[PDB]
């Protein structure tokens, strides 16, 4: 039982210590650079693992949830080996290292997931619609008894592979005549990590005919948290597993969910500067071009013919102005507004979608299917605890970017007056059900 685990750990250690192409051991230097900056994590490219040996890839693809903790403890063993001197024999504050995977396999649409993808590694893409608040998870628990009153420690991993996975309390004491489970939890001298929940929605253009989009639930932990914001297209690599809901129709039902292993995002969470040196040099070189203005102006909607001043206005809007502040506290606006008011057939709507696509943060909405309460701030109540809480609309979702509104005249007169302050001062004030909050929205 234990020998196979040791063999697998040894195989992974040999892989990580031996993998070199040309004259560089890439993973060891990656570990060094990660430890030096206090980022106890490692990234494995799947193609390298396949090329090194196929049996390890086969085992990982067969039972991922069981295999992965062995790899993630081999990583920390190697890190302690290649970072700490034994000195013929301390702090040793190195937790279990996080494993991150990347792959280039075929994508699978959300609606195509079925009973045959249970406990398998899958890759898929979607849109982020909501992020949950972070929560704590125990990893090393100090357990104390009452009658015999001794000390014990429990080590728990985050992978489950099954609904239970939980050793709540050992039956009987450790050897007089104590109870069944006479233990408590010593909250001090305990170690905790962080977990977060996310909701994913199907990409609009792959929705089947005459259907509505489907949502799914994903869970991430440690360094993968606090990475994605609502409204960002992402590519996820994870495990499609199921968990029971004893609190919650039918018989023997099990709600599926996704455990996040790796996230790729187009924006790369850049919006302080994090760009590569080569990219910064390329941007400076492009800015040195004597005719960058015409190059960018031609770039705005190349399939639209004739409009020039409109394209210049679009470029000036996307670039944006300069925010200013004053000693007495008065704010000054730093955005530019463009209104297109013309005859039909002049391709007004085709520019809006292109501007939405270009901008890093943009939302496209119609003035007909919209409401004043549904744009700035919606006051909802939790069905469980019955408490008022504030849910954002569309204008707050596009803060720091641009908002695309078409058919501005069809919008109701009552609705169109709410945007007055939201643009004249870029701050919205809500006084509903005793909630008095000033919310920021710059767009």
């Amino acid at each position: 039982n234990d020998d196979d685990n040791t063999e697998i750990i040894k195989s992974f250690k040999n892989f990580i210590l031996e993998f070199r192409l040309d004259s560089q051991f890439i993973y060891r230097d990656q570990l060094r650079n990660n430890i030096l900056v206090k980022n106890y994590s490692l990234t494995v490219n799947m193609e390298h693992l396949i090329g090194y040996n196929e049996d390890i890839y086969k085992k990982l693809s067969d039972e991922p949830s069981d295999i992965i903790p062995l790899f993630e403890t081999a990583i920390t063993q190697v890190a302690k080996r290649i970072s700490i001197l034994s000195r013929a024999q301390l702090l040793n504050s190195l937790p279990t290292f996080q494993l991150i995977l990347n792959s280039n396999a075929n994508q699978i649409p959300l609606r195509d997931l079925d009973s045959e993808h249970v406990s398998k590694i899958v890759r898929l893409s979607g849109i982020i619609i909501s992020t949950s608040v972070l929560s704590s998870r125990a990893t090393y628990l100090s357990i104390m008894c009452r009658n015999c009153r001794h000390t014990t420690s429990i080590t728990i991993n985050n992978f489950n592979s099954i609904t239970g996975n939980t050793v709540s309390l050992p039956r009987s004491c450790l050897s007089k005549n104590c109870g069944p489970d006479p233990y408590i939890i010593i909250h001090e001298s305990s170690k905790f990590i962080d977990q977060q929940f996310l909701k994913l929605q199907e990409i609009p253009e792959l929705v089947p005919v005459g259907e509505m989009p489907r949502n799914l639930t994903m869970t991430c932990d440690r360094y993968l948290t606090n990475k994605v914001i609502p409204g960002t297209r992402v590519t996820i690599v994870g495990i499609y597993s199921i968990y029971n809901s004893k609190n919650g129709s039918g018989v023997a039902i099990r709600t599926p969910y996704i455990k996040i292993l790796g996230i790729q995002s187009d924006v790369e969470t850049s919006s302080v500067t994090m760009f590569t040196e080569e990219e910064e040099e390329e941007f400076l070189q492009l800015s040195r071009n004597p005719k960058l203005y015409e190059i960018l102006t031609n770039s705005i909607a190349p399939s639209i013919f004739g409009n020039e001043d409109i394209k210049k206005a679009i470029v000036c809007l996307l670039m944006g102005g300069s925010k200013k502040i004053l000693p007495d506290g008065m704010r000054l606006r730093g955005d530019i507004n463009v209104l297109l008011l013309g005859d039909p057939g002049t391709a007004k709507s085709q520019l809006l979608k292109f501007v939405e696509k270009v901008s890093p943060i943009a939302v496209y909405t119609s003035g007909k299917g919209s409401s004043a309460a549904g744009l700035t701030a919606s006051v909802q109540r939790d069905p469980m605890t019955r408490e008022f809480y504030l849910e954002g609309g569309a204008m707050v979702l596009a803060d720091g970017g641009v908002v695309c509104i078409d058919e501005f005249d069809k919008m109701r007169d009552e609705d169109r007056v709410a945007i007055h302050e939201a643009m004249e001062q870029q701050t919205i004030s809500i006084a509903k059900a005793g909630i008095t909050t000033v919310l920021n929205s710059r767009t």
Binding site: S23, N33, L36, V37
Partner: protein
Amino acid sequence: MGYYDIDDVLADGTEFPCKFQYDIPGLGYLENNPGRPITKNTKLSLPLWLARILAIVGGDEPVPFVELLPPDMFSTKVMNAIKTDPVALDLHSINSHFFSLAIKWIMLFSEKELANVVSELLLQRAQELNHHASSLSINTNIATSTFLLKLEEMEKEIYKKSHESYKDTKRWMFK
């Protein structure tokens, strides 16, 4: 102290609080009404390059014309803040030429309690500087950038030189 040094020249331009220890008729013409003389104990914010010499000239009881008040940059609060945890301190906001002005201030006024604390501060920050410099990519979290934006003006030169040295060594090593 180099005549043709840009950084020293820039650091010489900061303003220090000071007070007119002596009353001089006809002064203040460069700040207020020229015909109105400046009275005694008048507080002003003067640049270093003249406050240093006007406070030592004397002129003539050979009291100098101006007396330099303790600047707010060197206060007990900052001393406690740097003594508590210097590695995480955002010393860039307090000043951009902090080290050079500290050198000049300690030169004008010998204070054995400043050299040791400043030395310990920079010694502690140097290890983090080297740790970040040795971390060559093979693209980073928020910690590296948020430390890098807390740096002093002069520390950037050390960081860049170390990074270039390590990059050159790595480039020559792997070919």
